[PDB]
C-alpha cells in the first residue's frame, strides 16, 4: 500500500553486471541465458536505454576465450554509459532496417599529434574485422589499442531515423573537443539517486521550480505569485552546491553560478558591471536558473558594513532583487553558512522570503551517502557501511567523502608499498585486485576530524517504547497529548478546548525522564532537540541569554518537532537551592524561555517537554495554566517493572538463559534505571577481562552478576523519596473532594 | 442612523455573476429578466461604467447554445473591466443614435510576426457576421480564435459624441502598444476596497493630500500651512508602498517613486544628481506626489555616519526638504521599517512632521485582506475566511497573500498529479476546476512562519463584561474613571478635579484582574497594550531599562489606548520579597516607568491599569497620589459568583441541560476563578479521550465532571487570604470616622 505505487523492479529484462578483466573494445562476450529468455533479436545498431537514454551500442558473438555464462566488458562503465547504482535499463532490439550512410568523427588528441597523411591507412582501415563500429547519434565508444583515452560526441543532427552504419566513407578534422566539464554536468544531474539525507529539503525545493519552469502558463492563469528568492542553509559541506547544480541539470534550464569570492576580487566598479550583466544575460535566456554560491561574501550588511565600494554591491544587489518584475522566468537562489550571517534587507518579500534549512544527515541519511562516493570502486564482502553511518555522528556530507578517501588511500600503501618498483607505468592487474577492509575504515575513522561536533543535532531517536523497562501508567499519558491534537484537530476544536503545550517531568534522578521524551518523538515521527543542563549553565555564566532564541526558531521551522530541556533546575541549583542567594527563582534563561514560550504559536506542532530532579526549587511562574500545564512523576520502579528493564538492558548482550533475572529485581530494592544499568555495564566489563587473561568463553555466566554485585550503589536513598512524596501530595491536596456524588 | 448614509444599495439595476465555462467572445447569452423589469433597450454601443467607467461593451440576442436563464461571460473579467468585489455597475442604454465613422486599432504582438499584406482580408474580414463590434473610446475588447492575447487602448480623442460604429473602414499600425505596468497600475488605484486594516491610517493620510491637491486655491486664502512631509511606519511587509501609490492613483497626480538602493547604488556623485533632478522634475509637473520606499537605506545618520559619500547624500537630502519654499504643491512622502533607524535632522518641523504609524491588523483587519487576494478564484462551499483570520494573528498583510499562494499551490500538485500527463499545451478543463478547500488552508498555516510575531500586539480585544463571572462590584467602579473624562470633560473642569491617571488591581492570582482591564478596552473601543511579567524581567536582567520609552511612546500616538501592566511586582519577587536584598524596593524598571509616568500628558486618553499579586512588595512610590490613586481590590467569587463563572466558560462546549452548576458551584468554596478554568478544561479533555476510544457521544455528560473531581486544585488556601485581609484594612483605616454628622 505504502510502496504498492512505487513497484518497477522484477522485470524481466535484466541482465548481470560485474568487474571487468578485459580491456578489449573489440572482443565482445555473448550471453546465452539473455538470448533465450528475452526477444533480443540480431541486429548492428540497438535501439537501447536507461539512464539519459545514453547506452554503448557493441557487436557480439564474439565468445569462447575467456569464460562462458559470464560476460566481461571493459572497465569504462566507471564513468561512460553509467552515473551511479539504483538505474534501470532498458533494451529493446530494433531490427530489419536499411543501411545508413554513416556518423561523424570527433578527435580528441589523436590527431593533433602525428602527421595526418591521409588518415584512413595509418590506423582507420586495419582495424575493421567482421566488426562494422555500429554508432548511435551522441553515444560515446573508446576502442583503442594502448593509451585508450578518446570521447565522443555529435552536436549537430543531420538523419532523423535510425539506421545501421557502414565503414569507408569520407569524414573530416572539423569537430569541437568537448572538454571534462561537460561531461562532469551530466553526472551532476542527480534527482535523488546521488544525493542522501536530503530527502525533505528536495521534496521542498523542486516543486518551487518544476511548475514555473516547465509549465510557465500554469501561473499566467491562476492568480498565483510564484516564488523569486530562496535561501539555502546549513553548515560548510552540507552540499549546497551539489544540490542547487543538480536541480537546475535536472529541470533543464539555463545556470549561471556566480560565485561570492569572484565578484569581490574585482577591481572598482567592475563587480558592479559583473552583477548587472548576469541578470540581462539570465532574462534573454529564459527560463533561467541563477544560483550565488556565496551570499555571507558579498552582503554581510550586518555588522560589517565598511567601505564605500562594499555597501554599493550590496545597494546594487537590493537593487537587482526587487527589481524583477515577472520579466522573465528567472529564480534566483542563494547559499549561505548561517542565518545570522546575512543582510536583512534580503530577508524581506519579493528578494528572499523562501527559506529551505539543510541540516546534517542522521543515520539513515548518512548511510545513503556512503554508497555514493563508493560506488566507483568494490569493496571486500566484509565490509558493511551500516555500522560506518552509525559510528559517524557529527559527519557532512564532505566528511563522509574525504573518509572514503582516506580510507582508500591506507589500503594503497598497504598492500602495493612492498612492490617496490618505482616505475612510472605501474602494470593494472595491481589496483583493480585493491580491496578496501574494515581495517582501513578503522584506522580512517579514528584520524578524521569531523566539522560538525559543535552543531545542535536534530534528528528522529532510534529509541523506542520497548527499550524503557516498565512504567506503562505514563506510556498513555504522553500519547495522549501529542498526538490527538495531531490526528484529529477537528475534536479539541469542537469542545473548544486548546491543547496543552507541555509536560514537565520531576522525580528521582536516573529514571527514565529523558527516555520518555525520545520514545514519544520516535513514535510521532518528529524531530528531537535536547537541550543539556550545561547548555544552560552557558548561557547564564556568559550572560547572553539572547541564544535562547535560536533553540525557539531551530524548533518551529523544523516542524513537527520536540523540545526537551533536561534538568531544567540545574541553574537554581548552581546559585544556591533550599537557600539560595537574597532572591527568588527567577534568572535571565528561564525568563526567555517564558518569554518565547507564551509567544510561540499554538497551532504549529512544537511540543515542549521538561525535566527536572528538584521541583521544590522549579520557578512556580513556569507551571502556570498555559505554559506547563501538566506534571507527571516518575516513581522509583517496583517489583514489576525492574524486570523489564533489566530485559530491555541486555538485548545488546549475549546472556545466558542460566541468569535468573526474576531473583535479581527482587533484592533490588532502592534501586533506580541508572541503578540497574551500571549493574550490567560493571558485569559485562567482568567478561571481557576474563576473555582477555585466558586469551594467554563467549558467552556470559552467572558468576560475573554475582561478583559486580559486591558494588553495589544506591543513588537514591530514602531520605530524598521522603520530599518527593510530600511534594505530590503537597500538589494535589484532593481531600473532600474524593466523593463528590451530583443529588439528581 | 450610524450606516443610514451609506445606503447605495438594493437598486433594481443589477445582474448576476457567476463562473465561465465558455471562451468565445462572438457568442454572449442573453437574459430574460433583465430585458423585462429594466429598462434595457436595443443598441451597439452602449454607455455604461460602474468601475472608473470602464466596461466592455458586446452584441447580444445570440443565445440558444449553452443554456437558458444564466448568462455565461469570457474568463477575462478577472483582470479587465473589474478590478475587485464591492463595486457597483451602473448601465444606461443610449439609443437612436447615428453610425459614426469607426475607432482606430492598435496591434500588440499579432502583426509583427507574419507577412502583412493587405491586413484586411487575412484574418480581419471573414470575422464578421450579424456582428459590428462596438468600440467605445478606451474600452478593452479581447477577441481570438486561438492564443487569446490582445490589449487596446487609445490615446488620441479624435471624436467628442458617442455613435455607433461601422466595418469597412481604413485602419494603420502607427499606435503605440502598451506594456503590463500601464494596466497594473489602474489596479492599484485603491480607495478602501483592496486595503484591508488600515482604515484609520487611510482617513489620516486621504485627508492630508486631498485638500492641497484637490484645491490649490484653498490654503492660500487662509492661513494654514499644509504638511511637506509625511513618514510611514510598520514592520516590513505591512504594506506601505501598497498605500502609498493608491493613494497617489486615487488623487490623480504625478507619482515619482524614488527607490532607496536605486539611489545608493549609484557611482560617486551620480546618486548626487538623481536626487537633485528628482524634485525640479516634480517642480514643473505640479501637482506633485514623491515618494521614498526606503528612507533608512538613504539616511540612516543614527549610529554608523561612514564615509564621506554617503553623509553627502544624507546632507543633500536635507538641503532639498527645507528648501521647498512654497514654489509648487508637491508632497514628500517617506516610509521605514523603524522609528530608531531615522535621521533625527529628518524629524524636525518643516521635513518630516507628520508622523503616520501602520501597525499589524487586527482579527477583522486580517479578515478584509483575505478577500482581496482571493477574489481573482473560486473557493470551495465549506471555506470561510472568519476562522483563518482568527487562527492567524503574527501575520502581516504579505504573510497572507503567501498563505492563500502556498494554499493554491497544494491544490495543484494534490488533484493534478494523478494526471501524469507533460504536455506544454494543459487542457483548461483541470485548472478552472480546481477548487481549494479547509484541508489546503490546514497544511498551509502548519507549513506557514510568521514575520510579526516579535512585535507587540496593539489590538482591541474581544472580551466583553458577559465573559467575567460576577463581580458586578467593580464593574461599576471601572466605567466611572474611564469613560466619564472622555464624554463629558466639562465636568471635570467645572469642579476643577482633575480625573485619575491609573488603577492597580491587587488580589490573589486567576481572580480577573486581566479580564476586567481588557472589558473595559473592550467597552471604550480603545487599544489594549498587554506588559507582561517576563517583559519586565528581561529589561531588568539585561540592565536596559531604556526600553520602557518606546512603551509609552507607542501609547499616547495610538490614542486612545489603556496601557496594562501584568504582575507588576515580578521583579521584587525575582530580587527576594519579604525578606529580599539589602536594599528597599526600587528598581531601575519601575524607577523608568514612574518616570514616563510623571511626564505624561494628562489631557491625553492614555490610562495605566496595574495588576499585582504581593501588593506587600509594592513600592510605595508608586501610591502617591498623582500616579494611581485608585485601588481595587479583587476576592475570591462568592456563592453568588461562581454560578455565573462557569456559565461563562462553558459557553462554547456543549455541555447538556443534566448538569447542576449551582451545586457545582457550592462545594466548589476555596477556588479562584483560574482554579474553575481548569476543571472545566479537563473535564472536556475526558469528553475527547472517550470519544477517541469509542472510535475504534457528541454531548459531554456528567459523569466526566465527576471524573475531573477527583484531581481538584487549590491554588488559594486560606493563609494567603490572611495577608490580603490585613492589609485591606491596613489601607483603609475608617474607624471612629463611620460616624461623622455635622451638628447644623
Ligand atoms: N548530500 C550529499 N550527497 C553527496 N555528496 C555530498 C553531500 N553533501 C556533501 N557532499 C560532498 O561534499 C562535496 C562538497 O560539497 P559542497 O557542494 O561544497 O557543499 P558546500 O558548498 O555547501 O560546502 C561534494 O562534492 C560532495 O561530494
Ligand atoms: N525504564 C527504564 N528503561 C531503561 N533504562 C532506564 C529506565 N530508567 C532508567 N534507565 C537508565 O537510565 C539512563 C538514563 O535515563 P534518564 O531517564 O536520562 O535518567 P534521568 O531521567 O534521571 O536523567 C538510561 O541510559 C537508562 O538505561
Ligand atoms: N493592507 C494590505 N492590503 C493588501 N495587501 C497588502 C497589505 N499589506 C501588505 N500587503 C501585501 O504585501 C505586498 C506589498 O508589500 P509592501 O507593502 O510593498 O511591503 P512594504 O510595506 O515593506 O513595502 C502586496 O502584494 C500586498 O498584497
Ligand atoms: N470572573 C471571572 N470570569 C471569567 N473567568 C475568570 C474570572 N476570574 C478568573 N477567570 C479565569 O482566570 C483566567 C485568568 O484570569 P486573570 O484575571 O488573568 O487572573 P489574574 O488576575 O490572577 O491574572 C481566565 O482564563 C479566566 O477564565
Known amino acids: 500500500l505504502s510502496t504498492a505505487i512505487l513497484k518497477q523492479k522484477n522485470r524481466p529484462n535484466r541482465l548481470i553486471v560485474d568487474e571487468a578483466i578485459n580491456e578489449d573494445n573489440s572482443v565482445v562476450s ?53 552515473v551511479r547504482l539504483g538505474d534501470v535499463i532498458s533494451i529493446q532490439p530494433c531490427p530489419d532496417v536499411k543501411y545508413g550512410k554513416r556518423i561523424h568523427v570527433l578527435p580528441i588528441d589523436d590527431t593533433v599529434e602525428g602527421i595526418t597523411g591521409n588518415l584512413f591507412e595509418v590506423y582507420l582501415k586495419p582495424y575493421f574485422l567482421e566488426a562494422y563500429r555500429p554508432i548511435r547519434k551522441g553515444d560515446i565508444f573508446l576502442v583503442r589499442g594502448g593509451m585508450r583515452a578518446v570521447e565522443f560526441k555529435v552536436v549537430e543532427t543531420d538523419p532523423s531515423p535510425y539506421c545501421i552504419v557502414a565503414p569507408d566513407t569520407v569524414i573530416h578534422c572539423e569537430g569541437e573537443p568537448i572538454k571534462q566539464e561537460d561531461e562532469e554536468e551530466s553526472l551532476n544531474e542527480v534527482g535523488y539517486d546521488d544525493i542522501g539525507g536530503c530527502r525533505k529539503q528536495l521534496a521542498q525545493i523542486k516543486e518551487m521550480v518544476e511548475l514555473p519552469l516547465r509549465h510557465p502558463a500554469l501561473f499566467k492563469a491562476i492568480g498565483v505569485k510564484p516564488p523569486r528568492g530562496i535561501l539555502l542553509y546549513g553548515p560548510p559541506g552540507t552540499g549546497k552546491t551539489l544540490i542547487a547544480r543538480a536541480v537546475a541539470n535536472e529541470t533543464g534550464a539555463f545556470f549561471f553560478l556566480i560565485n561570492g569570492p569572484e565578484i ?52 546594487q544587489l537590493l537593487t537587482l532583487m526587487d527589481g524583477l518584475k515577472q520579466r522573465a522566468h528567472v529564480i534566483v537562489m542563494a547559499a549561505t553558512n548561517r542565518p545570522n550571517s546575512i543582510d536583512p534587507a534580503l530577508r524581506r518579500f519579493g528578494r ?38 552509525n559510528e559517524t555522528h557529527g559527519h557532512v556530507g564532505a566528511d563522509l567523502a574525504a573518509l572514503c578517501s582516506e580510507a582508500a588511500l591506507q589500503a594503497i600503501r598497504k598492500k602495493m608499498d612492498l612492490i617496490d618498483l618505482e616505475d612510472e607505468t605501474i602494470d593494472a592487474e595491481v589496483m583493480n585486485s585493491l580491496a578496501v577492509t574494515m581495517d582501513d575504515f578503522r584506522w580512517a575513522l579514528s584520524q578524521s576530524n569531523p566539522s560538525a ?106 516542524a513537527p518537532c520536540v523540545l526537551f530541556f533536561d534538568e531544567l533546575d540545574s541553574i537554581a541549583k548552581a546559585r544556591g537551592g533550599n537557600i539560595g542567594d537574597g532572591g527568588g527563582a527567577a534568572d535571565r534563561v528561564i525568563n526567555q524561555i517564558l518569554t518565547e514560550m507564551d509567544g510561540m504559536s499554538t497551532k504549529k506542532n512544537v511540543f515542549i517537554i521538561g525535566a527536572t530532579n528538584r521541583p521544590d526549587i522549579i520557578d512556580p511562574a513556569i507551571l502556570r495554566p498555559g505554559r506547563l500545564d501538566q506534571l507527571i512523576y516518575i516513581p522509583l520502579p517496583d517489583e514489576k517493572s525492574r524486570v523489564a528493564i533489566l530485559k530491555a538492558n541486555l538485548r545488546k548482550s549475549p546472556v545466558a538463559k542460566d541468569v535468573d533475572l526474576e531473583f535479581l529485581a527482587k533484592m533490588t530494592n532502592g534501586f533506580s534505571g541508572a541503578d540497574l544499568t551500571e549493574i550490567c555495564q560493571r558485569a559485562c566489563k567482568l567478561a571481557i577481562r576474563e576473555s582477555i587473561e585466558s586469551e594467554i568463553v563467549p558467552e556470559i555466566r552467572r558468576d560475573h552478576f554475582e561478583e559486580a554485585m559486591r558494588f553495589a550503589r544506591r543513588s537514591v536513598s530514602d531520605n530524598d523519596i521522603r520530599k518527593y512524596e510530600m511534594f505530590a501530595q503537597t500538589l494535589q491536596q484532593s481531600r473532600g473532594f474524593g466523593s463528590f456524588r451530583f443529588p439528581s
Open 352 to 389: 528572499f522570503d523562501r527559506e529551505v534549512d539543510i541540516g546534517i544527515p542522521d543515520a539513515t541519511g548518512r548511510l545513503e551517502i556512503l554508497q555514493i562516493h563508493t560506488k566507483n570502486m568494490k569493496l571486500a564482502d566484509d565490509v558493511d557501511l551500516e555500522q560506518v553511518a
Open 453 to 558: 561536533l559543535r552543531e545542535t543535532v536534530v534528528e528522529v531517536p532510534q529509541v523506542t517504547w520497548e527499550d524503557i523497562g516498565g512504567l506503562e501508567d505514563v506510556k498513555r499519558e504522553l500519547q495522549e497529548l501529542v498526538q490527538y491534537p495531531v490526528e484529529h484537530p477537528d475534536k479539541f476544536l469542537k469542545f473548544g478546548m486548546t491543547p496543552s503545550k507541555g509536560v514537565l517531568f520531576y522525580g528521582p534522578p536516573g529514571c527514565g525522564k529523558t527516555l520518555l521524551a525520545k520514545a514519544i518523538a520516535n513514535e510521532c515521527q518528529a524531530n528531537f532537540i535536547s537541550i543539556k543542563g550545561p547548555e544552560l549553565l552557558t548561557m547564564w555564566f556568559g550572560e547572553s541569554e539572547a541564544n535562547v532564541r535560536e533553540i525557539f526558531d531551530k524548533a518551529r521551522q523544523a
Open 30 to 82: 555473448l550471453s546465452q541465458p539473455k538470448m533465450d529468455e528475452l526477444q533480443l533479436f540480431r541486429g548492428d545498431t540497438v535501439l537501447l536505454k536507461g539512464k539519459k537514454r545514453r547506452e554503448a551500442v557493441c557487436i557480439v558473438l564474439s565468445d569462447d576465450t575467456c569464460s562462458d555464462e559470464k560476460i566481461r566488458m571493459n572497465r569504462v562503465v566507471r564513468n561512460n554509459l553509467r
Open 264 to 315: 569581490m576580487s574585482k577591481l572598482a566598479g567592475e563587480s558592479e558591471s559583473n552583477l548587472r550583466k548576469a541578470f540581462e544575460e539570465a532574462e534573454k535566456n529564459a527560463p533561467a536558473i541563477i544560483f550565488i554560491d556565496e551570499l555571507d561574501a558579498i552582503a554581510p550588511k550586518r555588522e560589517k558594513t565598511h567601505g564605500e565600494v562594499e555597501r554599493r554591491i550590496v545597494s
